[PDB]
């Protein structure tokens, strides 16, 4: 299982003065940190969210972000000034940073930046560069950000070393939570005729759900999207199109790792 660590930052600038920045952090599909605009410090959303970092290492790392957040806010504002009247508020910046962990001690880090909902910029190698499709005016911002050698060297440290190291630490510390198995519960219902198999409360995400006459997998089964529950489990429904009257005979089979080979079967 390849685990992706994600730092998601979203920043809104309404006008020249007003601004908020909120962040959430994910390891796979589990939230590990929240950092809202209102809060001076980064919140742990899991007991093991500090990973294997000492207190001193964490304090020094948080402090770096604390400065980054304030600095980022102003730099966007000065960039908007530098570009105007080409670009103007409201503005939405999103960042997606982190690493993907692989078997052995291999990994891969990324830092992607979105402007008004379009991916435009990334950190790659030693510098910022625009990705294909990006407007040319971004070349001024990029040139300016690349002048800052201090920021460059730090971001290279974060992506090349801090991320992988830290996530290895997170994977050890949070193993119990990551490997948890929660059993799904299912129930049935119809609607105008369409049949619905409700599966909810399962962890982890991979699940098998099919409509069945006896043991002939109905080809017509349509899976919905995976919808989350608050308690960090999943919900999913499979719908089957039918002619009224022919419901009797149909059953719902549900396979999931938590069931330990004891598939849930639910006849109508």
């Amino acid at each position, epitope marked *: 299982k390849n685990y992706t660590f994600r730092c998601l930052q979203m920043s809104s600038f309404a006008n020249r003065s007003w601004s908020r920045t909120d962040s959430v952090v994910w390891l796979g599909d589990l939230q590990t940190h929240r950092w809202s605009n209102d809060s001076a410090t980064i919140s742990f959303t899991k007991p093991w969210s500090q990973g294997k970092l000492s207190n001193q290492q964490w304090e020094k790392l948080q402090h770096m972000f604390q*400065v980054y957040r*304030v*600095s980022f806010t*102003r*730099d966007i504002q*000065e*960039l908007v*000034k*530098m570009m*105007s009247p080409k670009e103007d508020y409201p503005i939405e910046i999103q960042l997606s940073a982190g690493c993907e962990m692989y078997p052995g001690n291999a990994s891969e880090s990324f830092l992607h930046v979105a402007f008004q909902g379009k991916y435009v910029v990334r950190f790659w190698g030693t510098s910022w560069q625009t990705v294909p499709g990006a407007p040319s005016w971004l070349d001024l911002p990029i*040139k*300016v*950000l690349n*002048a*800052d*050698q*201090g*920021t460059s060297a730090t971001v290279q440290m974060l992506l090349n070393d801090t991320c992988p190291l830290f996530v290895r630490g997170l994977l050890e510390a949070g193993k119990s939570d990551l490997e948890k198995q929660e059993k799904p519960v299912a129930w049935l219902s119809s609607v105008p005729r369409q049949l619905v198999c409700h599966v909810s409360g399962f962890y982890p995400k991979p699940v098998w759900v099919m409509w069945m006459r006896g043991d002939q997998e109905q080809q017509g089964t349509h899976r919905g999207d995976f919808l989350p529950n608050a308690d960090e489990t999943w919900y999913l429904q499979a719908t089957l199109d039918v002619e009224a009257g022919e419901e009797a005979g149909l059953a719902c089979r549900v396979k999931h790792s938590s069931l330990g080979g004891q598939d849930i079967i639910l006849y109508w």
Partner: T-cell receptor
Amino acid sequence: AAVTQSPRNKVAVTGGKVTLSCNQTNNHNNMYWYRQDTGHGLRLIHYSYGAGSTEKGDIPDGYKASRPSQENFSLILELATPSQTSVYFCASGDEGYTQYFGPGTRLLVLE
Amino acid sequence: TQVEQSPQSLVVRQGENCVLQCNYSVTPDNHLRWFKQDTGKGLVSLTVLVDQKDKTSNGRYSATLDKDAKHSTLHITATLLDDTATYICVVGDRGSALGRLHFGAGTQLIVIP
């Protein structure tokens, strides 16, 4: 990489218009205006990221800025007052951190 | 005012060495620069320090910077009469043009010939 200011010295009356000028031939996008008052450091009045753009600094009140071109940044005092007696410094720079400073301009505004 | 210099002023005999302090609260502190200013004149750069713990020299001028302490000093060796000037400490909050500079009020030096 040189920067010039004119006039280098100016005596003016209250309510008068004073224009302070800065010329820079280094093709620097960025220009800055400061005043120096004894017992303070230099303080930022206005600044500019390019032709046609001007921006307020920390102490912008009483001053208006004008950037007609890449080479000229100009500090305009519409209605001069004694409190604007000072020494004014102009600076320029590119994308990097260094600002290159002019030689200064002394202003005295008399009643 | 986030940049404080010490002493306010000092008087020194030609040939003697002197030391000037700068202490700041600027955040972040990308770099610190020392300027020399003769009365009636512009700002001439003596040195710029950029590393977390940094040392530099320029002739009879030398300087240290310690960013954890947010503290810098300027050493003038064997003062000459022309050293008579105000010495100005400046901290820049960015490694690029996006930064603001934060100026000290200066230290006034007088060298007695």
